[PDB]
Each structure stands twice: as structure tokens, then as C-alpha cells.
Design a protein around this ligand. Structure first.
Ligand code: NA
Ligand code: NA
Lengths: 87, 9, 87, 9
């Protein structure tokens, strides 16, 4: 189905392919961007510890602060995903 | 701890 | 010019009108959503302490965790703004 | 500390 493109990453190379997995499952399951975003957020809070934040959309700009090595931003198809750890 | 700007294409 | 609509807020009633100000100035100054977002982020990091995160866009869903009383989400015209404190 | 879902109209 969808094509994973990483645009900016500061994160273990494994957690990246992991972040794509959690998102690919989320895209397969949910439709609303808010919903997709909670799935990913919750899964990362579960696996790696709190506190993840996730933004899912086709149009937004961001400026966030993230703990070192805990930040990814990528596209799955035409939806884009921002997933960082701060808190 | 660092900081990132991101913008959709 | 633009019409400020608050959609969800957990934040002092004053910091809200403040968040609209920081955004209205940001919209007047910058054009790219990423840029607008950094202006607001940086200003809040300045006034109220670290650590703010800001998302600016016309299309995105979010799921974040924020410190109590440090969260706003609102529209300025057709752009929407998410501004929370976690970290 | 709390948690919020937001979605654009
Ligand atoms: Na999960
Ligand atoms: Na400022």
C-alpha cells in the first residue's frame, strides 16, 4: 500500500522502522488523523516510556522541543507524521 | 534535548 | 483582519488572549506555517517558561500530553494553532 | 498533567 519516507530523524534506526510499523498499523485501522495520532502516541508511551506526542496531517508546520534521540518526522503516503518525546 | 522545525511539502 | 476562535482550552483566560496576540503578530509577520509556529513557540518559552510546542496548519490531527493549565488550541481565520507545554 | 485529542474541521 503506502510509501514510507523519512524527512528528518533523530532516533535509533530501529525505533524508526518501529515508528513506521506503529503508523502503518494505525493507518490500516483508523481514518481520522486525530485517531491515527492517538494510536501511535499510545503505543510509544507503552513501549518506550512517556511522554510522546504525535501530530498527523497533510498540512501543518511545527516547532517543538524534543528529548535527544527521541524525534521522528516522516510521510506515510501523503499523510505526514511527527512523533517526539518531551515530558 | 534539542529543537526542530517541520513543514509539510 | 482574521477571526480568533478557541476550540479547546485549558489555560488562564489571560494567557489565552495572550496566545492569540502572539499568533496574530506571527501571522502578520511570517507566512510559512513552520515559521509562524516557531515565533509563537519562542515567545511563550520566553514569557512563560520552557517548554512550549506549537503546531500551525490547516489540516492535522493531534494527540499530545500537556502540563495542566498549559494548553490551547484555536483558529486564527482558517489556520489552526496548537500550543501546549510539556517538558 | 493531562492529554488532548485535536482535529481540524
Ligand atoms: Na499500543
Ligand atoms: Na518572543
Amino acid at each position: 500500500d503506502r510509501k514510507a519516507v523519512i524527512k528528518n530523524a533523530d532516533m535509533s534506526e530501529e525505533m524508526q522502522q518501529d515508528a513506521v510499523d506503529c503508523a502503518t498499523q494505525a493507518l490500516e485501522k483508523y481514518n481520522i488523523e486525530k485517531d491515527i495520532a492517538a494510536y501511535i502516541k499510545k503505543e510509544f508511551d507503552k513501549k518506550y516510556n512517556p511522554t510522546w506526542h504525535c501530530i498527523v496531517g497533510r498540512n501543518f508546520g511545527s516547532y517543538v522541543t524534543h528529548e535527544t534521540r527521541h524525534f521522528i518526522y516522516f510521510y506515510l503516503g501523503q499523510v505526514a507524521i511527527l512523533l517526539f518525546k518531551s515530558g | 534535548v534539542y529543537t526542530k522545525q517541520t513543514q509539510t511539502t
